[PDB]
Structure formats: C-alpha cells, structure tokens
Design a protein around this ligand. Structure first.
Ligand code: PRO
Ligand code: PRO
Ligand SMILES: [Mn+2]
Ligand SMILES: [Mn+2]
Ligand SMILES: [Mn+2]
Ligand SMILES: [Mn+2]
Ligand SMILES: [O-]
Ligand SMILES: [O-]
Lengths: 468, 455
C-alpha cells in the first residue's frame, strides 16, 4: 500500500501502520462491555494556527491521537471509525487542489468526504452513539479537546469510554511503530555523534543545537524537534530561547535533544567533556551514571515495577558518590533519608511515543508516589512488552538542593563538604537512552558512544565503526 | 546602556530602541484629542503554549506590539506606559532573578510582579487604561486586549491605541533599521549558500534546512520569520534538471523579520525561456525600486510591474496586441496574482497597510495588495514582482473573450509547467528614493557564476 516518505535515505512508513492502530482500537472497543453496537469514533484533527493576531503561520504539527489513528498531515480534518466494521472515513476541508479520491488513495482509508458534510454523512449512517475524546494528560494537567462540529448536538455523544482505551492502545507499540522509533533514534543518535565531533571550546551552545537540527532535518527529514532541545531559560526566560552560554575548557557538556519523524519522537541525552578529555573527577561522576544506566537496563523486563528501577538508580548513585568521598556513612541510611533525590531530582524515565512524554503513565488505579524523586516519575506502572521508555539517570550538583540537605539534620551528616566543595559548579551528567520492553528484557533503540573511551574516540573523529 | 546579543558576530541591539518606541508612541498619543490626561497604556505579553493537551512546549515568540514597546523575551509579562510622563513599568511573573535584574536588563523605569498589577495601577490613579484592540488587515484577526484580575474596576478604552501604535510601527527608527539591515545581511548570505549548494536530485527541504542552519548558527536567528517556501510541512519535491527553483525564506533576529526570494535554474544554467521570464521580473523589480520615493502611490508601482511584465511577455510571443488594452483587461493579474509587496518590520506582513481612510482596490492583482498607501520615508517594504504560469488562471483568461485574444496559445503551451519566478528585495524609503537592504546575486551572469562555484 501507500507509504509516507521524504525520499533520499528517509524511512518509508506504510499507511498500514495507522490502519493497524484503527483495527486495534476497534478490537479493544468491541470487547468493552459498555460500547453500544453501531458506535462511531469521532476524532478532530488539529487546525493551522497563527502568531497571535498576525497572519504569520506557526508550523503545523498534527494532534497526536488523530495522528495515531490516521497519519494525516493536513490541517482542518476530522476522522471517523465505525467500531463494528472498522470502516474509516476521513473528512477533509473543501478548499493544485486534491480530490477526495486523492486523499482516499494517499491514506488508505475506506471513504473521504468534505468537512462541511460531516453532519449529513453521519446522519445518513445512523450511528447509535458518537465516541469522542476527553480526558486528562497526567504530564500537562490539560484536558484533551473533544471533537465538535455544527450539528453534533443532534447526536448522542459519549466522551468517557474512548480516552482510556485509545491511551492504552498508544502505550503498547506495534512492530510497525517500533520501526519508526528505531529510525528516529538512529538519526538522532547520528546527530548526537555529529555534535560530539563538532564541539569546540569557545562555541556557543546554540551553534550545536543548530547543527543537531540541521542533521536531523536535512538527513532525516525531521522537520520538528520532538521537544525543546536542551543545551537558555536563564538569560531569556524559556527553554526555547537560544542557549548562548560560551563553552569553556574544563566544562562538562550535557546535550538533550531528539528529532521527530512523521510525529514519532526520540529523546536522547549525551554528556561529555567540552575539550574531549575526561578529567578524573568527570570520569568518576560520569561512570557513576553509566553504571546506574546499565544496571537499570539490565534489570528491566516485564513485571518490573518502574519505581523500583528509580530506587535502584538512586542506590547506585549514592554508592558511587560515597566511593568518590563526596558522601560518607551508611548507604542504607542515605536511601532511607531519600538522599538520592538531592542528586537526581527528576524521574528515572518516562513513556515515549508520538509524544516525548507519552500518554498513559497514570491510568486509573495507578498512584503517584509522594516521595522525593519518585513524585517526579511520569509513570508508576509495571513494565509490559511493547512499552517504550526512556532510561535517564543523572547526577547533578545543584547548590540550593545541596544547601538544603546541609541544613537538614537528617541528611547533612552524609555530606563531606571538604570533597563536595570541589564539585560545586561541576555541572550535570545525564545519560538518556530510549528502549523497548520486550518479552524478556529490553531492546536498546539508542546508538551513541557511552563509555569514556568511546566518547573520547568519537570526539577525536574516529569512524563510528571503531570500537575501543 | 544594556543590549541584546547572542555573541560571536551577532548584532548588539540596544534596549534604547524600545525606549525610543515608547517615547514615540506617547508623543503620538499626547497629540490625540480623545486621549485623556493621566491615561496609561496597558500591554499584555505572550505566554508559553503547549501542543494541544500535551506538555510538549511550543517555541515561544513574543507578541509583536509588546516586543515593539519593550523588547522583552520572557513569557507571562505585562508592560504599561504612563502617557503623560512616558514612565515605563514591566510586570514579571513571580516564580530566579530579582525585579532589579529585569529593570537593569530592559532599562525600564520600574519592575513589579504580575500578581500586583491591579494594586500598582490603582495606586497611580489613572483616568483610563488604553488597551490594544483592532483588526489585522492581513489575517482578519482581532488583536487580543490585555486583561488582568481586577481590570473591571478601571475605566478602559480599547479603540484609541491600536491605530496609533500601528502608525508608529509603520515608520522605522534608525535603530530598528540597523536590525533589519542585519537580518537582511544574514538571510542574504544564507540565500547565497543555498544557491551554491543546490544540486539536481536534492530535496527542497534539504536547502530549507541549510538556510535555517546558516541563520541560526551564524546569525543567532532561532526563528524563520515565516514558513519557508521552497519552490521548484517539508517541501519534499525532488529538484529536477530543467527546473526553475524559487526559494522564499527569511530569518528573524530578536523578533525583527526579513523576507527574501531568489529564483534560479536548478542546474545552474538559464535556458532562453527561463532567461526571458527571469529578466522580465528583474526588469520590473529594478523599475519599481528605481521609481520608489516619498509621494509614490503603491498601487501605481503594482501596475508598473504589470505593464512591464505584459511588455516582456508580448516580446516573447506569449502575448500579442496593445499592452494598453491588456492592462485595461487586467491581464497582468493572470501572471502576477498577488500584491507587488508589503510592509515589513516585526511581522513579515507588517501592520498598518490599511488604516482608516485607505481603501483596498477591488481589481484583480490590486485587491491582493497589503497596502494602498503612498510611500513616506521610514517605511520598509518588500518589492516582489513575479511571473507565474498557473493553469487555472490561464484557463480562465482563455475562456474570457476580453482577454483570450491577447494570448498566443501555441506559445503559451510551451510555458505550461514552466513554474514561476519571483524576485523579492527588502527596501527602505528614504527622503529621495530607497535604500536596498537585500544583497544577493540577481543578474543572470551573477547567478550562473555563483552556482558554478566561482570566486
Ligand atoms: O521531564 C523529564 O521527565 C526529564 C527530566 C530531565 C529532563 N527530562
Ligand atoms: O503574501 C504575499 O503578499 C507575498 C506574495 C506571495 C508570497 N508572499
Ligand atoms: Mn531528554
Ligand atoms: Mn526524557
Ligand atoms: Mn516572501
Ligand atoms: Mn513577502
Ligand atoms: O530527557
Ligand atoms: O514574499
């Protein structure tokens, strides 16, 4: 059948991918006892937006649930799925201008109609109930926009059934979806290598962000970054602003960037010395995060409770920080005092898919854990095959977190100021891989240099094939 | 005083630019007979947005009127200006920098937190708050009026400000022109790099990518001014041998735009037909720039470009008959359906093209003009004539006996799928003529030498 493709070396994505998602959603809804016969799923695609009151266009990016179901890149559409038969209808704006037939062929749907006819067409199809999308995103706190059209009031509308079901479908990636996520990770990994090869003392961080974006777009067809790429919030107020810090000798760099292809995300972080040679201290902190990274990846398999992996990373960080002489005392005591969250205040990792922070981390019955570090986890679910997660432990030296710990009698004793003082302004190490949960373990999607020797080799311009 | 700067070779933009804008706005309001003494201008800045219901951030870009007045890059702010004294107060979110930090950074008279805006304005006992509401004549959208908790307690006027701040934006200060010269410099350089890099077989988005990379990495231009048009949402058309490329792209620096279009043969060599069409647009481009000066009516420039295009198309054999008669039948709009050019500034399609008293001309071509004003010094415009071979426009003309007679179908057939040529320059009106901001290869000889890798 047809496939989405941007030519050259970019990935051909069969539109069958979305047909399989529609099939899976219908199969789930058919097994749902509360779904009436003759129900129709109604999704509304995104519309083009402009900057405020101007006619300056904002680059259009399809709404994620609508993309997941249909793969449609055009703004202003609606999409309908008959639950009982699986029949799909795309509604496109009545505006070279393409025919309805052109869109039917392009997207391999069963029917195409114009948007202004949606009320007439649905009336004629006599559905029992329209199933629309409404629910809460547990990362943004926002409520998903329910589809609406002139005349929808004449129909029976249920806005509670669909959201948890289509979320759960998105949580489990198909083999076709994995092929795209492998590709996004391949291009983003190559871009990360290019950045490590290009970085020079004296460069502005945004020069590297630009290079990353150029690699992803020109060689990967990735028009969008998946998320705001982190290399300043400080100097200009938003993560999106150019990071205009000058890279200095002795710096540890952290680049957190990932491109998006056809609305499938990647999210990768590399940490490395600006000048291409790890100091003893840098090697020590870095290899601590490498150790937790690898321990978690080695422990992940179906049935594993994700918060247990976060705690495992914490324990390893604390062990290694103690082996460095930054911390002293009982590691068990440190864990009881939640000392790990001083060095890693964020969650270990999160679902990834069409969204960087993908849906379904906190379905009904799954509770957020009200402890330092863990409260920042974007899911507290148990791992199952088909999930895609980031694994992103880090160690940070953040003054106000350290000072707070030093002011806390329950924590302050564990800290050796004489050694710690040398790590003030050390910076940050984070190692972020993307992985798939398999039937028995994981598959690593990311492919960047990770050991000290591999990183130093990459920055010295060694061919990627070279291995130390 | 302080300046915006992204280091390396990027431009230092004095925050004094925005101070001057505020003063200019107050000077204008003070002359407005409806403006009450003790009025305060209230502007609301943009806020951070996310993609739909996700936590995926959308790259923040400041609202244009608010940027013009304050140069503030942070989301979630307000800014007010005492009309009588010119005193400026910035309101920032309480979140980490001090208010003192923001005062120093933006060279405003006072900084407060946003949650105190009602209390602060109340203490200053204004007659009325002047808020922003009006219609953008390019989008049809209504400007969003500032609002805050407790604003209901104030007398608010939302009619006075818009036309007055729009009018200020129409006329660029020397400091603004410095930034627009810079954005044109970098975008010009990026266009040259694109011309050097184009190879048959490439995808258009590869050149869009290169352009953005040059502007960002070398210019500190994070944003494209507008969605990039890459003729021959990624443009994934393969550049083919024999194609005429059209690349319309411009970077933005600190919310100051640029808008440049280059047309050139994909394979680096103009055919006779391509040279003929291209040099027709070069001729109208140069004729319009030459004729521009204070007092010139912009629609006359549009019709000048039409006349020249028709003359050249007749010379080529595409058309026959009286060019006078052709103009009377609006034949120019078949080949150039859009307006000749538009105001440019903080927005690519900048404000103020149709203030009250200036009417849109209801004729083909001219109705798409984004201004029908007379030119005055300080105005910044694009000059972007083009010739297009658009089947449905051509078909409509061939069906209409008043136009069909002028067209030589046997010659036109050859130009079906020719594509299109547009040449877009950015210029400023001076006391005597114009200053050209754009600096790219333009003659056939310059373009071919550039693409051949010469120099
Ligand atoms: O938001 C999150 O979950 C991770 C934490 C570090 C940056 N991204
Ligand atoms: O919108 C305008 O007015 C010009 C002409 C077409 C491309 N930009
Ligand atoms: Mn990340
Ligand atoms: Mn992440
Ligand atoms: Mn343009
Ligand atoms: Mn333009
Ligand atoms: O991340
Ligand atoms: O343009």
């Amino acid at each position: 059948g047809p496939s989405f493709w941007l030519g050259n070396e970019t990935l051909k994505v069969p539109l069958a991918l979305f047909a399989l998602n529609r099939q899976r959603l219908c199969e789930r809804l058919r097994k749902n006892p509360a779904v009436q016969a003759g129900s129709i799923v109604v999704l509304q695609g995104g519309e083009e937006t402009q900057r405020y009151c101007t006619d300056t266009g904002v680059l259009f990016r399809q709404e994620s649930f609508f993309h997941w179901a249909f793969g449609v890149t055009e703004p202003g559409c609606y999409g309908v799925i008959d639950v009982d038969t699986g029949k799909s209808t795309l509604f496109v704006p009545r505006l070279k201008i393409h025919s309805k037939e052109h869109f039917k062929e392009k997207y391999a749907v069963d029917d195409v109609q114009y948007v202004d006819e949606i009320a007439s067409v649905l009336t004629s199809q006599k559905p029992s109930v329209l199933l629309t999308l409404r629910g809460v995103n547990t990362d943004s706190g926002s409520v998903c926009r329910e589809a609406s059209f002139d005349g929808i009031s004449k129909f029976e509308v249920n806005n509670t059934i669909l959201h948890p079901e289509i979320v759960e479908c998105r949580v489990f990636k198909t083999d076709m979806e994995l092929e795209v996520l492998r590709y996004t990770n391949k291009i983003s990994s190559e871009a990360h290598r290019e950045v490590m090869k290009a970085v020079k003392v004296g460069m502005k961080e945004y020069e590297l962000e630009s290079l990353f974006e150029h690699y992803c777009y020109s060689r990967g067809g990735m028009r969008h970054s998946s998320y705001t790429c982190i290399c300043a919030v400080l100097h200009y107020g938003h993560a999106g602003a150019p990071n205009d810090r000058t890279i200095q000798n002795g710096d540890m760099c952290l680049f957190d960037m990932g491109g998006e292809y056809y609305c499938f995300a990647s999210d990768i972080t590399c940490s490395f010395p600006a000048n291409g040679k790890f100091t003893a201290d840098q090697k020590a902190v870095y290899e601590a995060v490498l150790r937790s990274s690898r321990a978690v990846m080695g422990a992940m398999k179906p049935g594993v409770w994700w918060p247990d992996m976060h705690r495992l990373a914490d324990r390893i960080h604390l062990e290694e920080l103690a082996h460095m002489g930054i911390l002293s005392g009982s590691v068990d005591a440190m864990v009881q005092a939640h000392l790990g969250a001083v060095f890693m205040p964020h969650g270990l990792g999160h679902f990834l898919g069409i969204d960087v922070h993908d849906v379904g981390g906190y379905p009904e019955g799954v509770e957020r854990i009200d402890e330092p570090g863990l409260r920042s986890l974007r899911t507290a679910r148990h791992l199952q095959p088909g999930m895609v997660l980031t694994v992103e432990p880090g160690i940070y030296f953040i003054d106000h977190l350290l000072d707070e710990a030093l002011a806390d009698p329950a924590r302050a004793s564990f800290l050796n100021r004489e050694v710690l003082q040398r790590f003030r302004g050390f910076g940050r190490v984070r190692i972020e891989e993307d992985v798939v949960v398999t039937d028995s373990g994981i598959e690593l999607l990311t492919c960047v240099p990770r050991t000290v020797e591999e990183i130093e080799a990459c920055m010295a311009g060694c061919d990627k094939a070279f291995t130390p």
